């Protein structure tokens, strides 16, 4: 029995120190929602293989997770929202591995539970206060870049792979000079037989400094320090530092501990730390199993990364805009307010942890800028693909069109034009003084 | 070349009416409003000269616009920018910053390469006008 | 167009150097399997935002993944198996982050593809040859333990949490003395307010040495070195080493780079390295998205861990026995032969990488030993929960029953008794000379 | 106490017929078969004395059983074990090892605690019989 | 002094017919052909300005020659070079690079010696024309 | 018996993973070629001192080298080509010492074999994939130098020895300024009573930077870091690095392990690594014993050096041009095709290892440039001796003549002139605008 073993407590009162989780539970055909919740609770805590004297040597109750609330998923008769409470003393301070191990690991249910997704977490203030939060954060990153009141612009180098150091630097230089604030290594580009990492870093720095001298702006290139071992990541991070890079990147696949290690390094060495997280990882459009991205957003803001890809509403990624708005809030706000439509199940105080910058990447172009400003706000990095590199007039020109479109939309937003309704005419008034933009707009309206 | 520091530097230079509408934005955001100027246009020159103090609790753009034009008259061969500071908790910082005057001509920057260990280079940029004293610039 | 852009090549000939992936693809309602495969291929390689001059500066074709074979999933009209080839030069040698980033990251398909699971990988010999493989491996681990011809026995400390160092060591000592080869820290037990890690390690070592002096065997306790940063993991690993521990453990949630870093440390310091991986992680019983566990098994054997939980067939985890047999083969064999029923889609030579030991954990007891020996073989660690700690006669006694049952079944296997059919009578002949086993057998036959 | 090194040491001592059936197993696994003996029963004593060489290419358990009993007669107050070595590629090692003789009485081990830095201890175990010369043991 | 970056810079400046024969070479090597120009002639200035994109799949030297002469007209007081890029696997890089225009006069470089630890010196070279803005060079 | 012990297997099938060797075997007067091959095979593997029980504890066959093919040397009745196969698992990954120890060490034959030379090796792809290959490589070295489409020019300082630091720097400066891309330390010049190494390095750097400021080119001087111990080599390497040298050199006599150590250092510190190997070492024009230079070329490309002296066809070294062409291919090509006339006995895939630059050194002058371009190609460093220093007009002038002759020949090659037939008229048209070359050509045509 699980409901009778302590694990189900409808009368439990949550404390300000509890860690809370909301699971979307799908119970075994002919099993009770209460027993299902209880199972999930009892598995992610004290595993009852029946009768254990050694429990009575400890304050047993304290270590047991409590299923305290179950609601039917509205619009789905067979799925339930189970709310579970965990005592703060179960968790290692400052450790994402320990948090994730504790919650999504122990949580079984073979006989009572058919499917389980983690939807949201309420990390209590005193727990959050044990984490560094973003190495830099939005406010500091903007002070370092001297860039205020607009989204930042970036793109990945095209092609992803195959360019030598020198031809790679060429792209970086053209794009930066043309208008972009940042260029980036692809998540795949680490160190490979077609190009090892040291020459890339060396030519990139030349490109970046050339571009700053040609524009009078701070410029950056996300040098990918992702590697197989920590010592190797440190070596790559240490060259970015040495050469004066403003920014590096890491791939979420390095995993939690390497991320925390890197977040602390970026804090200690004045480096902006961009995290790459695949928008369409095979582990994507689930309703059944896994964990929702909002939970990743909470943990990564706690770990201490400065940028993470959060989604668009439009373009190629077909997001529910209100769910996305919910990911942005998680990343940016000092306090989150429950709002079921955004998929935020808990109020949450962020304990003055710094802000992470959302990144919008994926099939976006200059003709959607009104929708992009309207859905995503001004604290965002917008990343355009062959939206820049494949301008018929050159990479510089592609960059210029994106940058003009952005400034023009922000100017109209600030003037209080109904830029969502009048967005196309706004872009067309801008293109009038800007041939590269005129050329950009014609291209993505004729068919594509 | 055109220096592209500033929120709107990829747009044409702002007219007085456009400038007015941006002051209105800042007013409704409840920002302090500062006017700063410089003729050392290095991207890491964080501290331009202040033209007066920032204006607090502003309700009418006209006094802001008057000081912009007074600075334009006193300092026409300088960069002049308008900055909006937020005092909102967890921001406490500039949230908008745009050019309202540029010199008639920008010569740009020199790139210096000091050769270091192996293939690494230590870089400096030096604005050409800074090779001259302040009163001879632009 | 994706099928017309190079990405679909039905005539492609795979090379011995190619990295191959098999995805289970579910195409968008009214999209073609060929276009779906092509999309997956074209996303996990050169992202075609249409027209990019810079491609012509590189040997473009080389960097493009090839969809080369599509089969309808037999028993599922709407799902397809897409086989994709990747050139070896795309991949950083020795890097799991790079492999996983390359394959499951870039792989999108918003408009053509509804769902995608990675089912299997063919890592080519020359690639595998770039990885360390298990720090110790099965053969060496058995030479260090002086334990041949039988599964090893372990259990997790009960309760998971709350015992002080001294009462924690007590359990470890009783269980080891009673018969178990190993005791383990729970994956949740790192360092927490109820117990910090140094005192645990210190009392555990006393227990382990007491148990060796009481039995004349090598004994071990998996000390969990899981921590938030690399320096912290190293500190914990360095105390296990200093105190003479035979074995440590890490949680898969530390992530790939910390795992590789730890695998190299365990190789260099003569330490057996057990990896904890949740058998029922929310990311479990999927048919739709994610990646199949056999792929994790390949990557972890390459990374270099010595133990990983691979499943049971029986007990609480309701596995398809033939799929499980497939996970074991991945871990243990020097060569894998395609076998669709086991879910192995490729032949694969393991390039003389050492063997990883499967761990069977989860609702198993001494009365199923015949099924356990028959399904799982002799190279396995069998972990029994309150199957030991909650014996009415004591922890020592619980350990003894499990150990006798195991030896008795292996003895009958070696005598060529049809131990699967006559398993209950075999256990009953053993219990005749063993009261603890008699007591164990009565308990799990009366009801449970 | 009972020393529980060996594959079957939690079972009662094996009869000659049980021993015969284990030799048959090894024969069908195509193992080399060795007989080793010791009266230093430390778990890290990797090298027991060999009673003759291992037997290769064996087809009949009787000659194996004869040598086990000859060792039992020559060395009755010793531990005696039978080892099966595999030459299979990627194994090349013992795959079975079991006791076929124990001394009549086992006194066990001494635990030595040498106190080291802070709270750490360096441990040794010493089999009690090893405090005596070989010919006085058991 | 004469700057000797370039494959043929120790030869006299190439005539249009010599230039034509080098384009033919690149065509038969199946190279992409780029035209780049600069008036910062530092040897570590890896990135000259591109005059248009590189020309791919070229079969007739005339359009290449036309763009060389158009660049010569627009940028006569610049260095102008022609680059041939190979996409051949395991090369993927420039395999020829030669000057097709030099300024009428080259002043050369300044050598800077920053004194460091013991007797070591950190060196920079600075092209003299780079002490002036781009539009005042040569 | 050796042919009857397993070592001769005419029916053996080579695998893609085997390491293969081709020995030129001269059997004892009145011994059989089959027994001779077998002896060589059986000596470089499991030494049969007759009857060894301990073999049966191992997969014995695996460790035995197989003589699998014997051919009579065409044009030599008494000599045979023996082809021997070795399993990949015999070899330590990444270790030249282990490879050379394994192959040319164990290989005896007192009673059956009179003389033995190793002619060629087929290193399998998966083995090659375990080595770094060139620290820099040709493509990257040219990107760093900004030098494309022509050979590079160098010379050794004359005299070899005796100049003070300051007078030594003088020569370096004159030669570099005059046209040469590189100047070099002699292999003999390390650190000696007439000149210690630190002052040399310090004055050389001044010369090199003066020469770059006088030409607008990247200039280099091979600073010799050769020393008696590793710590000493590291100290010398670390000063070259600190002072900003583009290139260092080492002598092949430091030996394999110091070479690998240095190759890894040059990769990690962005340094071109030139290897000096004596063209006429006493160990030179053999047909009987030793190993052929093509094998050294394979191992050094694997170890990771960036330049090695490969020979000329003409000048003072009297090479067979087709054998030399074979050394160049070994160094430069991504795949080697069997070609008996070039002395390449195996096809070989280079597994995307970087290219080593051949160096042509030895009694060459500006009047042979057509032959040099024709035999050696454009990826080569041509080193001229007193061909530069002993120009009657000065070192600068000597350098200029060599550089003009080179550019003029490459220009004629690109124009498709039959530069081999019309080479003298090409040089004479160049000398018309170049007095230093006119003077050079008159000097080496009047007598010498
Ligand atoms: Cl400095
Ligand atoms: Mg991204
Ligand atoms: Mg486990
Ligand atoms: Mg040489």
PDB file of N, CA, C and O in Angstrom, chain A residues 40-59:
ATOM      1  N   UNK A  40       4.571   7.684  -7.258  1.00  0.00           N
ATOM      2  CA  UNK A  40       5.526   8.716  -7.688  1.00  0.00           C
ATOM      3  C   UNK A  40       6.265   9.392  -6.518  1.00  0.00           C
ATOM      4  O   UNK A  40       7.492   9.505  -6.539  1.00  0.00           O
ATOM      5  N   UNK A  41       5.511   9.823  -5.506  1.00  0.00           N
ATOM      6  CA  UNK A  41       6.050  10.364  -4.255  1.00  0.00           C
ATOM      7  C   UNK A  41       6.933   9.364  -3.515  1.00  0.00           C
ATOM      8  O   UNK A  41       8.032   9.710  -3.106  1.00  0.00           O
ATOM      9  N   UNK A  42       6.435   8.133  -3.355  1.00  0.00           N
ATOM     10  CA  UNK A  42       7.083   7.061  -2.586  1.00  0.00           C
ATOM     11  C   UNK A  42       8.284   6.447  -3.258  1.00  0.00           C
ATOM     12  O   UNK A  42       9.154   5.862  -2.600  1.00  0.00           O
ATOM     13  N   UNK A  43       8.330   6.586  -4.582  1.00  0.00           N
ATOM     14  CA  UNK A  43       9.480   6.140  -5.372  1.00  0.00           C
ATOM     15  C   UNK A  43      10.612   7.186  -5.347  1.00  0.00           C
ATOM     16  O   UNK A  43      11.771   6.811  -5.117  1.00  0.00           O
ATOM     17  N   UNK A  44      10.282   8.477  -5.553  1.00  0.00           N
ATOM     18  CA  UNK A  44      11.277   9.584  -5.458  1.00  0.00           C
ATOM     19  C   UNK A  44      11.720   9.953  -4.010  1.00  0.00           C
ATOM     20  O   UNK A  44      12.376  10.979  -3.776  1.00  0.00           O
ATOM     21  N   UNK A  45      11.381   9.082  -3.060  1.00  0.00           N
ATOM     22  CA  UNK A  45      11.858   9.184  -1.681  1.00  0.00           C
ATOM     23  C   UNK A  45      12.119   7.772  -1.115  1.00  0.00           C
ATOM     24  O   UNK A  45      12.757   6.953  -1.786  1.00  0.00           O
ATOM     25  N   UNK A  46      11.607   7.482   0.087  1.00  0.00           N
ATOM     26  CA  UNK A  46      11.954   6.252   0.835  1.00  0.00           C
ATOM     27  C   UNK A  46      11.315   4.957   0.291  1.00  0.00           C
ATOM     28  O   UNK A  46      10.215   4.582   0.731  1.00  0.00           O
ATOM     29  N   UNK A  47      12.025   4.265  -0.622  1.00  0.00           N
ATOM     30  CA  UNK A  47      11.521   3.033  -1.299  1.00  0.00           C
ATOM     31  C   UNK A  47      11.060   1.911  -0.338  1.00  0.00           C
ATOM     32  O   UNK A  47      11.895   1.203   0.248  1.00  0.00           O
ATOM     33  N   UNK A  48       9.739   1.755  -0.177  1.00  0.00           N
ATOM     34  CA  UNK A  48       9.200   0.768   0.781  1.00  0.00           C
ATOM     35  C   UNK A  48       9.177  -0.678   0.255  1.00  0.00           C
ATOM     36  O   UNK A  48       8.153  -1.166  -0.254  1.00  0.00           O
ATOM     37  N   UNK A  49      10.329  -1.336   0.370  1.00  0.00           N
ATOM     38  CA  UNK A  49      10.406  -2.796   0.394  1.00  0.00           C
ATOM     39  C   UNK A  49      10.050  -3.180   1.845  1.00  0.00           C
ATOM     40  O   UNK A  49      10.802  -2.877   2.787  1.00  0.00           O
ATOM     41  N   UNK A  50       8.900  -3.847   1.995  1.00  0.00           N
ATOM     42  CA  UNK A  50       8.079  -3.846   3.240  1.00  0.00           C
ATOM     43  C   UNK A  50       8.767  -4.347   4.562  1.00  0.00           C
ATOM     44  O   UNK A  50       9.284  -5.484   4.623  1.00  0.00           O
ATOM     45  N   UNK A  51       8.766  -3.473   5.587  1.00  0.00           N
ATOM     46  CA  UNK A  51       9.446  -3.669   6.909  1.00  0.00           C
ATOM     47  C   UNK A  51      10.989  -3.446   6.870  1.00  0.00           C
ATOM     48  O   UNK A  51      11.741  -4.242   6.267  1.00  0.00           O
ATOM     49  N   UNK A  52      11.434  -2.354   7.511  1.00  0.00           N
ATOM     50  CA  UNK A  52      12.855  -1.963   7.591  1.00  0.00           C
ATOM     51  C   UNK A  52      13.135  -1.278   8.950  1.00  0.00           C
ATOM     52  O   UNK A  52      12.874  -0.078   9.110  1.00  0.00           O
ATOM     53  N   UNK A  53      13.656  -2.043   9.916  1.00  0.00           N
ATOM     54  CA  UNK A  53      13.941  -1.535  11.282  1.00  0.00           C
ATOM     55  C   UNK A  53      14.823  -0.287  11.332  1.00  0.00           C
ATOM     56  O   UNK A  53      14.657   0.558  12.212  1.00  0.00           O
ATOM     57  N   UNK A  54      15.751  -0.196  10.383  1.00  0.00           N
ATOM     58  CA  UNK A  54      16.740   0.877  10.340  1.00  0.00           C
ATOM     59  C   UNK A  54      16.150   2.303  10.138  1.00  0.00           C
ATOM     60  O   UNK A  54      16.771   3.281  10.549  1.00  0.00           O
ATOM     61  N   UNK A  55      14.963   2.403   9.523  1.00  0.00           N
ATOM     62  CA  UNK A  55      14.154   3.649   9.478  1.00  0.00           C
ATOM     63  C   UNK A  55      13.924   4.281  10.853  1.00  0.00           C
ATOM     64  O   UNK A  55      13.863   5.506  10.973  1.00  0.00           O
ATOM     65  N   UNK A  56      13.793   3.457  11.887  1.00  0.00           N
ATOM     66  CA  UNK A  56      13.443   3.966  13.209  1.00  0.00           C
ATOM     67  C   UNK A  56      14.638   4.580  13.958  1.00  0.00           C
ATOM     68  O   UNK A  56      14.510   5.027  15.111  1.00  0.00           O
ATOM     69  N   UNK A  57      15.787   4.603  13.274  1.00  0.00           N
ATOM     70  CA  UNK A  57      17.044   5.213  13.741  1.00  0.00           C
ATOM     71  C   UNK A  57      17.213   6.661  13.233  1.00  0.00           C
ATOM     72  O   UNK A  57      18.239   7.292  13.447  1.00  0.00           O
ATOM     73  N   UNK A  58      16.192   7.149  12.536  1.00  0.00           N
ATOM     74  CA  UNK A  58      16.235   8.379  11.765  1.00  0.00           C
ATOM     75  C   UNK A  58      14.884   9.048  11.968  1.00  0.00           C
ATOM     76  O   UNK A  58      13.946   8.392  12.441  1.00  0.00           O
ATOM     77  N   UNK A  59      14.772  10.335  11.628  1.00  0.00           N
ATOM     78  CA  UNK A  59      13.475  11.001  11.682  1.00  0.00           C
ATOM     79  C   UNK A  59      12.731  10.667  10.378  1.00  0.00           C
ATOM     80  O   UNK A  59      12.552  11.528   9.520  1.00  0.00           O
TER      81      UNK A  59
END
